[PDB]
């Protein structure tokens, strides 16, 4: 912590007060900084599900390469994860080990969907807006940031009517019709 001299750094090399090997390079912290994750245990709650997908993918690739059970369940899991939005392509089954990843499950969260739909300028702005209760999917208002938005369910991410944000974008283009409140 004091920038050890040469004899000290030679004499105690494995000493590190910040980065440990159980930390795994602080990647929970790293991807929760990237996608602005509030609570500490969401990374590991997603890591359990990525481990489920990859455990099944291992145990399913250990079946013989031609039997219809392996082919049906590999294709069925691939279709389910593409439809949910974690996987970005349902083509190859090496996605079920390589491209299945806590960052993919985190890119499917509601503020990241928002920021990619240009509905907020950054992920922290999207977090603030859906905490303030501006965003509804479908009819019903969504209030928490961790909400996972599937591919067919991202067509209905809008703002609530009577939103001040909806009002100011309509009045920026002065398409505001005050009959329907905005």
């Amino acid at each position: 912590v004091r920038k050890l001299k040469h004899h000290e750094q030679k004499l105690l090399k494995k000493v590190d007060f910040l980065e440990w090997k159980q930390d795994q390079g602080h990647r929970d912290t790293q991807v929760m900084r990237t996608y602005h994750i509030q609570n500490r245990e969401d990374y590991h709650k997603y890591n359990r599900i990525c481990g489920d997908i990859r455990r099944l993918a291992n145990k399913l690739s250990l079946l013989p390469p031609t039997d219809p059970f392996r082919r049906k369940h590999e294709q069925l899991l691939l279709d389910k994860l593409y439809a949910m939005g974690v996987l970005t392509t349902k083509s190859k089954i090496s996605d079920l080990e390589n491209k299945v990843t806590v960052s993919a499950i985190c890119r499917r969260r509601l503020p990241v969907i928002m920021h990619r739909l240009k509905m907020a300028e950054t992920i922290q702005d999207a977090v603030k807006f859906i905490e303030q209760g501006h965003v509804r999917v479908g009819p019903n208002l969504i209030n928490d940031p961790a909400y996972l938005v599937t591919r067919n369910m991202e067509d209905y991410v809008t703002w609530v009517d009577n939103s001040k944000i909806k009002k100011t974008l309509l009045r920026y283009r002065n398409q505001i019709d005050d009959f329907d409140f905005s």
């Binding site: 912590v1 590190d16 602080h26 929760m32 900084r33 602005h36 994750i37 922290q124 603030k128």
Partner: protein, 175 residues
């Protein structure tokens, strides 16, 4: 009256300078080509020449039975001063007790000797550095890599054991 999007403060491996990989928190230098040189001529060197030897040149001299100073003299037809750097001498001593003949032929009062000031005994690095610094040196060598380095840097004549006598290449006044 709290703040929105509240997070738990963790450390930033991209930013925190307390950890080691983030401890990394103009004047150009174009060295002029030497005033000893014409385009590729080296118009300034003149006899008495001085020639930097290395270890495989000495080994090939003894394997071909050429004397060092007399082979240099009847190669260049000029008076030569041969120079063993301390790293070439270190390399000959490190070659072991098989090369005792070569070591005590390099120990010769007619062969003068320089004093290199660096760590390690890499004679190719030392010869290349002290020849591209100064351009007043002939390099006598038989290493293929050192021969390619020396004949790529300009204005430096290169001597080598070929056949039963020494040959010289980048010296344009040999006859």
């Amino acid at each position: 009256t709290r703040k929105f999007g509240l997070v738990k403060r963790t450390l930033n491996t991209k930013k925190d300078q307390r950890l080691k990989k983030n401890q990394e928190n103009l004047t150009r230098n174009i060295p002029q080509v030497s005033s000893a040189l014409f385009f590729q001529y080296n118009q300034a060197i003149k006899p008495p020449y001085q020639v930097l030897i290395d270890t495989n040149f000495i080994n090939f001299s003894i394997q071909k039975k050429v004397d060092i100073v007399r082979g240099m003299m009847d190669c260049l037809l000029a008076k030569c001063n041969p120079l063993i750097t301390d790293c070439v001498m270190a390399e000959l001593e490190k070659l072991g007790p098989k090369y005792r003949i070569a070591l005590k032929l390099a120990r010769d009062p007619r062969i003068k000797r320089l004093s290199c000031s660096h760590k390690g005994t890499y004679a190719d690095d030392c010869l290349v550095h002290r020849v591209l610094q100064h351009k007043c040196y002939i390099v006598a060598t038989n290493d293929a890599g050192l021969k390619q380095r020396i004949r790529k840097i300009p204005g430096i004549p290169l001597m080598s054991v070929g056949g039963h006598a020494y040959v010289i290449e980048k010296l344009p006044d040999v006859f």
